[PDB]
Amino acid sequence: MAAIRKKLVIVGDGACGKTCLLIVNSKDQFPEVYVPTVFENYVADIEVDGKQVELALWDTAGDYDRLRPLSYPDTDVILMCFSIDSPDSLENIPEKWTPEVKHFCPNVPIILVGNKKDLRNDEHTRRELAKMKQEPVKPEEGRDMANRIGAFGYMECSAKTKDGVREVFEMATRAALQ
Numbered sequence: 001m002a003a004i005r006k007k008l009v010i011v012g013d014g015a016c017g018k019t020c021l022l023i024v025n026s027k028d029q030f031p032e033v034y035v036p037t038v039f040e041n042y043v044a045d046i047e048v049d050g051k052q053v054e055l056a057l058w059d060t061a062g063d064y065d066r067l068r069p070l071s072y073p074d075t076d077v078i079l080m081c082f083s084i085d086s087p088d089s090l091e092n093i094p095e096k097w098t099p100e101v102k103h104f105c106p107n108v109p110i111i112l113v114g115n116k117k118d119l120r121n122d123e124h125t126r127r128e129l130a131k132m133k134q135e136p137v138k139p140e141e142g143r144d145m146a147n148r149i150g151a152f153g154y155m156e157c158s159a160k161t162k163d164g165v166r167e168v169f170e171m172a173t174r175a176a177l178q
């Protein structure tokens with residue numbers, strides 16, 4: 001056994017699924033009834049490529065705007081997260097969110113998460129994004145937006161479906177052990 005202890009702060013706009021990522025990964029079941037603003041005070045255990053890490057998993061909001069700065073220190077990994085149904089949200093990833101880390105977090109890893117993977121091959125999205133014609137975010141459009149900013153790694157995922165969720169945390173593990 002070991003005891004590697006690593007902070008992870010999840011940053012981003014509203015409606016990416018921050019807290020549905022933070023919860024679901026904990027409990028392994030989507031909050032279908034009610035979800036808070038923020039869900040904090042959580043540790044994941046991840047036994048990955050040999051090493052066992054205690055990956056502490058924090059969060060942020062905006063509703064608590066003046067709390068983003070209080071949560072940045074000691075970060076061993078940032079989860080900057082966007083939502084594929086709000087490509088307007090990848091538009092903030094370069095203005096704000098990256099402009100904030102390199103103030104409250106000089107260096108520090110970033111792993112780009114692209115949530116709401118489900119609202120991509122949907123009707124009501126292709127019917128609404130496409131009503132402002134905004135074709136839901138494609139993979140290589142993100143993947144390479146993550147290269148620009150610095151993301152040692154790229155991820156997308158769903159928390160309704162739960163496919164990816166562990167890798168969005170496991171890839172971070174390695175990211176805090178790199």
Ligand SMILES: Nc1nc2c(ncn2[C@@H]2O[C@H](COP(=O)(O)OP(=O)(O)O)[C@@H](O)[C@H]2O)c(=O)[nH]1
Nearest residue numbers: 013014015016017018019020116118158159160
């Ligand atoms: N379709 C879909 N909706 C999601 C998913 N994850 C979260 N949501 C929606 O996002 C809502 C709230 O987003 P939340 O997790 O609070 O975002 P935050 O403000 O960024 O922390 C949930 O109540 C769901 O309606 C997902 O994987 N797929």
Ligand SMILES: [Mg+2]
Nearest residue numbers: 019036037038
């Ligand atoms: Mg929430």
